[PDB]
């Protein structure tokens with residue numbers, strides 16, 4: 582008997598549901614998508630197969646009007662419908678934009694329900710742009726703290742970091758796609774780890790060990806070819822221009838390297854050393870390797886870091 586973990590991605594509120602819509606468009610298989618919102622108009626446009634309208638008696642079908650208490654009460658009163666949607670999950674990713682009413686208030690309730698049901702629960706949330714003002718930032722910070730209390734692991738993306746990767750003309754929607762990559766590639770990295778039996782094998786139990794009840798996390802992937810490919814891919818995997826939690830200080834890392842038949846012992850050590858040197862801690866590594874012959878000169882390094 583083999584194990585095949587059930588993964589679910591849950592968008593909560595406006596930003597979370599747009600991230601879900603964009604991920605569905607990008608294409609993802611063997612992942613269930615759930616869309617949760619107070620805003621019935623936006624939920625009607627969701628591409629997810631499971632849509633949950635919360636708080637209709639409270640908001641009359643509108644959003645939360647920037648009030649986190651409304652988001653929280655909305656979720657609590659739809660608990661049974663949220664549980665039904667999560668049922669069967671082995672891992673749940675909850676994504677939401679903090680600072681509004683629905684995400685801030687409802688996302689921690691959703692995450693708490695998932696964890697109480699035994700699922701490995703990961704949050705990936707944004708903080709608002711500074712141009713949205715102090716009050717939005719303060720509401721968002723309270724949401725982040727509530728999320729921390731309710732998840733196994735949390736990845737925070739300050740939206741201000743998007744201003745570091747655009748030029749004056751980059752479309753807003755293109756910047757948003759860059760932030761979407763954090764969650765999408767983290768999910769895909771776990772999917773790929775579960776689906777393949779590696780020459781040095783890691784599986785969902787290793788994911789649980791690295792992520793259960795840990796706090797902040799980093800999830801990254803790097804791909805490189807040619808000379809110094811392993812160092813370059815490892816540096817890319819831990820590079821964090823959009824992340825609140827960098828690699829620095831990590832005390833546990835799951836690292837998987839995938840390459841073709843040319844994958845060398847020496848370069849696997851090089852990659853492992855990059856990660857641990859950048860952590861600047863004594864890192865408890867869980868190391869894996871997959872030989873994919875279809876790959877020629879490409880190497881892929883996946884990292885999950887916790888223990889901050």
Ligand SMILES: Nc1nc2c(ncn2[C@@H]2O[C@H](COP(=O)(O)OP(=O)(O)O)[C@@H](O)[C@H]2O)c(=O)[nH]1
Pocket residue numbers: 593594595596597599600644645646647677678679680681682683684685707708709710713717740757760
């Ligand atoms: N990166 C990103 N940030 C978003 C997006 N949509 C909303 N935001 C951020 O999320 C915050 C909450 O917006 P929203 O999710 O629409 O509020 P809610 O629906 O009331 O929870 C905003 O203040 C923005 O900082 C998105 O698509 N991408």
Ligand SMILES: [Ca+2]
Pocket residue numbers: 773774775776777778779782783784
């Ligand atoms: Ca595996």
